[PDB]
Each structure stands twice: as C-alpha cells, then as structure tokens.
C-alpha cells in the first residue's frame, strides 16, 4: 500500500511553501473554474536569464518512512512560442532535497540542498493564445533514499523556464497485511533499494498450528510494498479443516486427527458418527481400536 506524506492538492498552496527570490520568481497561482479552488505554483521568467528561482516545501515529518517517492504533475511551455527567448530560455527544472531533524522554515540556505535529478517534460505546452488555452499534463516520478533524519525538505530550482506545477505527492510503500496461508502477517514498511526487507513472520489464525517438524510462516516484504515468497505456513490443528482462510471444526460425522489443513476425513468403518470438530474417532459401541477392529 501507499501512505501519503504530502499532497499539494489538499490545501491552498498546501497552506505553505517558500519562494526564495522574495516576491519575484515563483508565485503561487490558482483558478476557480468551479466551486473547487485549484492551487498551483508557476514561474515564467524566460526573457531574462540569470535566474535562480526557488520553491521550498514545508518540513514533512518522516515518521517510519524509509524510501519516499515523488510524483510531480506539471506542464511546460515551448521556450519557442515566446519570441525573445534569445539564449535565456530553458525547459528543465532541477529537483532537490534536504534532510533535517528539525523544521526551520523561511531560512532556506541555497547551500544545504542535495539534488536528485533534473526533470524535464515529455509533452510541451504549445498554443497560439498567450493564455495557453488547453493543457498537457506531464507525469514523472523519482525516489530518494534511505532517509535518516526526523524529516526532510523538497526544493524546486528554476533557471528561467515557463513551467506550471500542478501537484506534488510524496509517499512511501508498505506491505498490506496479508492473511493467506492460515497465518495473519501484519502490515510492514518498504525498504530502500534491492532489499530482503524485514521478512515479517505470520500469526497462526484460529485453530491453526505450525507443524511440529516444520518451519514457521514467514513472508518477505519488499521495496515496492509487495509481499513475496511465502516461507513456512500455519496448518489447521487436529479436529479442524481449512474452510476459506480460517480453521473450521469438522462437521458431525467427520474427524481430523491428523493436524493439517487437509479437509475432514470421513469416519472409518463400523464407528459411531463422531461429533462436530472431532479428533481421532471415538470407537463405536462394542467396537475397539482406522476401522475399529471388529
């Protein structure tokens, strides 16, 4: 599963975020086409150059997150649809990140920010009208990890591009509480890269017991958030059979002495109908102990 740590389309400007070049540069934008205000950030300083426009997000609380994923939705103009972009117009923005144990805010230090990668649009917004009549939503995704401090910062550096940032999502993966194999495996966190991450063992469901000469149930949670490779299992105890993913008592006339998930075995020859949930079959009146030796 995914546990969201930051969404831009939840509050107005996520109700935060800093613009380093003071008022000029990045400016939070918004449109009210409907009764659902849609906040967004933008910068369109193409015809100037020497641009150091920044946008820093608010301190996100790391929690149990170990690898964070970043999903940006944006559009970019042509760098060519504006006559006058002479050797001052670029079409890429650089994505940064900084790791901190304490929220600082409004003290963005250009220095202390490590870069992930320079993103670029896969579709260019071209239009005749200056207002750019329609839209082309680019969708690209990066991840950075492992994270160490109690939180982090995201950054968006611009060198004079006309970009339209529409959303920013930051999430981490989590393995979602499987219950198969008569064992209840709890939900666990994802790993950093190529890990065997925390092969969380299972919890035997009702009336399920690990075989004496058998390995304990264990499943390997992975970086993507997917469970993997079941090792071991729980088995329905004596007197119980595997009905769906829970051990159920043997129906009247059935027994399950062999402690296993195998269905209820039928009462052998010449034996009184064993009651519900029976273990080894009680012999029959006059019959003494598999068929009760006649």
């Amino acid at each position: 599963k995914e546990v969201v740590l930051l969404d831009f389309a939840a509050a107005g400007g996520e109700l935060g975020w800093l613009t380093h070049p003071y008022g000029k540069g990045w400016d939070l934008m918004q449109n009210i086409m409907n009764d659902m205000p849609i906040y967004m950030y933008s910068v369109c300083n193409v015809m100037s150059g020497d641009q150091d426009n920044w946008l820093r997000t608010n301190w996100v609380y790391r929690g149990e997150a170990e690898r964070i994923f970043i999903e940006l939705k944006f559009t970019v103009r042509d760098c060519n649809s504006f006559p006058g972009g002479a050797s001052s117009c670029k079409e890429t923005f650089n994505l940064y990140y900084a790791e901190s144990d304490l929220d600082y805010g409004t003290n963005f230090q250009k220095r202390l920010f490590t870069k992930i990668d320079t993103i670029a649009p896969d579709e260019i917004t071209v239009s005749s009208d200056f207002e750019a009549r329609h839209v082309k939503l680019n969708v690209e995704e990066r991840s950075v990890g492992p994270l160490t401090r109690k939180g982090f910062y995201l950054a968006f550096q611009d060198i004079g591009a006309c970009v339209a940032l529409l959303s920013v999502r930051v999430y981490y993966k989590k393995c979602p509480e499987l219950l198969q194999g008569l064992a209840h495996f709890p939900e666990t966190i994802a790993g950093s890269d190529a890990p065997s991450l925390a092969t969380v063992a299972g919890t035997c469901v009702d009336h399920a017991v690990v075989p004496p000469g058998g390995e304990e149930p264990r499943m390997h949670c992975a970086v993507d958030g997917e469970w993997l490779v079941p090792i071991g299992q729980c088995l329905c105890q004596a007197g119980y059979e595997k009905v769906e993913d829970a051990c159920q008592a043997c129906s009247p006339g059935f027994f399950k002495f062999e402690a296993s998930e195998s269905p209820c075995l039928e009462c052998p020859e010449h034996t009184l109908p064993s009651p519900e949930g029976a273990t080894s079959c009680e012999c029959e009146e006059g019959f003494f102990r598999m068929p009760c030796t006649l």
Partner: antibody, heavy 129, light 106 residues
Framework: EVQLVESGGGLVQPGGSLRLSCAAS????????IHWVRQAPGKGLEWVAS????????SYADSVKGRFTISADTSKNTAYLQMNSLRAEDTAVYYC??????????????????????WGQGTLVTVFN | IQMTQSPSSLSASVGDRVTITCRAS??????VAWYQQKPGKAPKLLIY???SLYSGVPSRFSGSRSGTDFTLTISSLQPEDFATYYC????????FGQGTKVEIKR
C-alpha cells in the same frame, strides 16, 4: 505611488494619425500588462489593445484591428498607441491601465492580481473637420 | 463570449438594497470584476476576483454570483457612489460591462 498619465489628445482630420502616450509611475510595466480602454460619448467602455512589454505579446479588438498599434518603450516605462485612419466612430476618451499577466488560462496571480486596479484620467481624441 | 447587463438603468431611495447582474453568456473563466464610472471622471476599482473587495472600498459592495450570474450588491447607501456601474470579465477579452445607470432618490 502607482500613477498613470495620458497625453496626446487633440483634434485630427478624418483619416489622420494621432499618437497617445501613457506614462507609468510607481511600478515597472514589465511585471504587468498595459491596456487601452476608450469611452464613446454617452456609451459604455470598450477595450482596445493590450501589450506584454516583458514578453511582447499583443492583442487588439476587431473594432481597431490592424488600424491601431500598441507599443511599449520598456526603457522609459511608457506605452503608446498609434491610431491611423481615425474614423468618426473612433472619437472617444482613451484611458490606460494595468493588470497582471498570469500566463496560464484562467489562473490569476493570488498575490498580485487586482483587475485594472490603477487607472489614468482620460484624454480626448476629437476626430472631426 | 458576450457579456450582457440588466437592468439598463434604475432609480432607488437611500437605504435600499440594490443588485445588478452581468450575464456571462459563455464560460469566460470565472474571474470577473465590477466597477463604476462617474460620468466625466476617471474610473476606480470597486471589486475584483468576483469576491475580492478592493482595499478601502466600503463594505457594502459584495461579489455575489450564481453560475454565470456574476453580480454586485450594495447594503443600503452612503455619501459616495451613485454612478453608471460597469462589470468586467477577467479573462483574456477584458470586455467591460455595458453599464447600469443608478440614481439616488430625493
């Protein structure tokens, strides 16, 4: 502080040429558009032209399309409108104003949007003989 | 897009609630503004963004709207105002409203 002044009015012959100038004060025309709005005698307001001195994008109404031209000498914070082939209909009082650019359709500058906040005073271009 | 107004003109007494609607025939975004131009005087901004009151403008002016029924409203009346009131669409055309002649009674 943010002041707009218009000059260049008078009487010109039918089909003549006049030049109107809007002098901008207290702000940089690079961070805003420049508009020209005329008011015919007894009628409402009509938008004429727009310019984007930082970007250079222009726009005109079909009433004056081709005949009227808007310019911006970005070195002196001044916008101009050169009217040619003045018609008897074109006689009006021409105002100049400003507004933010907001390059994305329907998106407007939450921090710096104030639709036509500052205005000029009015200059008369009599087109008669 | 064709901005239209109604009523063309009106007269009312002091202390009267008044309303004039700018019918946005087509979906010209939603950013609109309302102004008021003194006959033979430079206009001043009244309200913009269809809700954002120009700083210092009296509180009676209000940006009400119902779909494409962008409209202005005044609580009762105070010393200033009483002109022909114009609207304007904030979209690219910037086509200002055709006006509505208001009149103080006596």
């Amino acid at each position: 502080e943010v002041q707009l002044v218009e000059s260049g009015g008078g009487l010109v012959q039918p089909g003549g040429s006049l030049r109107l100038s809007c002098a901008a004060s207290g702000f940089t025309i690079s961070s805003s558009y420049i508009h020209w709005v005329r008011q015919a005698p007894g009628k409402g307001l009509e938008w004429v032209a727009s310019i984007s001195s930082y970007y250079g994008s222009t726009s005109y109404a079909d009433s004056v399309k081709g005949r009227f031209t808007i310019s911006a000498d970005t070195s002196k914070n001044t916008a101009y409108l050169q009217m040619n082939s003045l018609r008897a209909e074109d006689t009006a009082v021409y105002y100049c104003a400003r507004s933010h650019y907001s390059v994305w359709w329907g998106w407007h500058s939450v921090s710096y949007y104030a639709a036509f906040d500052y205005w000029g005073q009015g200059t008369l271009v009599t087109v008669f003989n | 897009i064709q901005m239209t107004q109604s009523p063309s003109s009106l007269s009312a007494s002091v202390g009267d609630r008044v309303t004039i609607t700018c019918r946005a025939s087509q979906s010209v975004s939603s950013a609109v503004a309302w102004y008021q131009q003194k006959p033979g005087k430079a206009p001043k901004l009244l309200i913009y963004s269809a809700s954002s009151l120009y700083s210092g403008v009296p509180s009676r002016f209000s940006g009400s709207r119902s779909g494409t029924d962008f409209t202005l409203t005044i609580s009762s009346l105070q010393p200033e105002d009483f002109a022909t009131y114009y609207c304007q669409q904030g979209s690219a055309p910037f086509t200002f409203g055709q006006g509505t002649k208001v009149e103080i009674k006596r």
